[PDB]
Amino acid sequence: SHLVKIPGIIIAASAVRAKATRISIQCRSCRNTLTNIAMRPGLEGYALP
Amino acid sequence: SIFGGTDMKKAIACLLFGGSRKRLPDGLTRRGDINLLMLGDPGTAKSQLLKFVEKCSPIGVYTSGKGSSAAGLTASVMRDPSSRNFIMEGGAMVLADGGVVCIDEFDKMREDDRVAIHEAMEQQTISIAKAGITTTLNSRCSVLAAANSVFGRWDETKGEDNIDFMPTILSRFDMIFIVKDEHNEERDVMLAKHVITLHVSAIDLAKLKKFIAYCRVKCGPRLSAEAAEKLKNRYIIMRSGARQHERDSDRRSSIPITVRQLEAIVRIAEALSKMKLQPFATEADVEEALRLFQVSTLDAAL
């Protein structure tokens, strides 16, 4: 969790795909939204409320 | 950093800039590049010139006829049964599209590569059609091909027979130089001097490659009618001479001199005038092109 510069050689690269940064959810009963939830960066999921 | 070979240096110069592609109002395509074949001896710096030219082209790949270590020569495409995607292994020809391939051991090439190269060289594609797809890859490449003659060096007794390539792959070319180091005492002692001078001493390269890209992107050289008429006259004369040597020897010449060679002079003149970025190449440029072409034709009439 520090700042690290390194030398390396790439050997593959997965596709460019879509990870979220803001996500709006909505309830199933009243349909109220809970918009603009701060999804974290990097590989870090988020347990729904 | 090579002793002599001045015609070969100027030939490499013309090669690196190459001609100018023609797409005609019908739709057909004519190449805008030059091919340099370098038959000859071991001792001369054939592979070393190949090495430098790869270094000095903007984009260039120096390979063997027998593919490369974990890299083919022509491209291939193959279905992937899991994901169904047609993965495209890129050979030298396509990995240096828009560039200079420097093939070595052209004599010693694969048969599949021989066929695909026959399609690829003078007309700029590599078509492949696997079980599902039918591609036509784009292969814009200029060839610097080396090779040895079969019998070690050029023996004079086997002239007109000491080459194993087919005429339908010497046709594709635009100048074909033989290199033999036969009997030159002064040249060879000076050559020893030159090489050890390199050993002890050890424009610019980056500037030259940038200038090469600059000329190629900026100017389209395309000859003038007077130059075309001069080339016409010397073309009839050259073809008459080739026919004459053919019937004199009474056996068909081992190296075509064809309309491909006419257009080779055209491309050579265009590249020369590209050195000055003048969109109308001069009769002087076409004359020096014919000079280089006669120094190429030294073997055919021979």
């Binding site: 390194i6 390396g8 790439i10 590989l43 870090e44 | -």
Partner: protein, 42 residues
Amino acid sequence: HMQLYCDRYLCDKVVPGNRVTIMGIYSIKKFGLRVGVGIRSS
């Protein structure tokens, strides 16, 4: 080896085979908390 995570304009700037000098942040994955324990995929 190391698994690497790019971002918006670090994506597709490098193609497979290109050596890199790359400046980033060491990290372990966070997906909700094998003879070993406490070993998340770095």
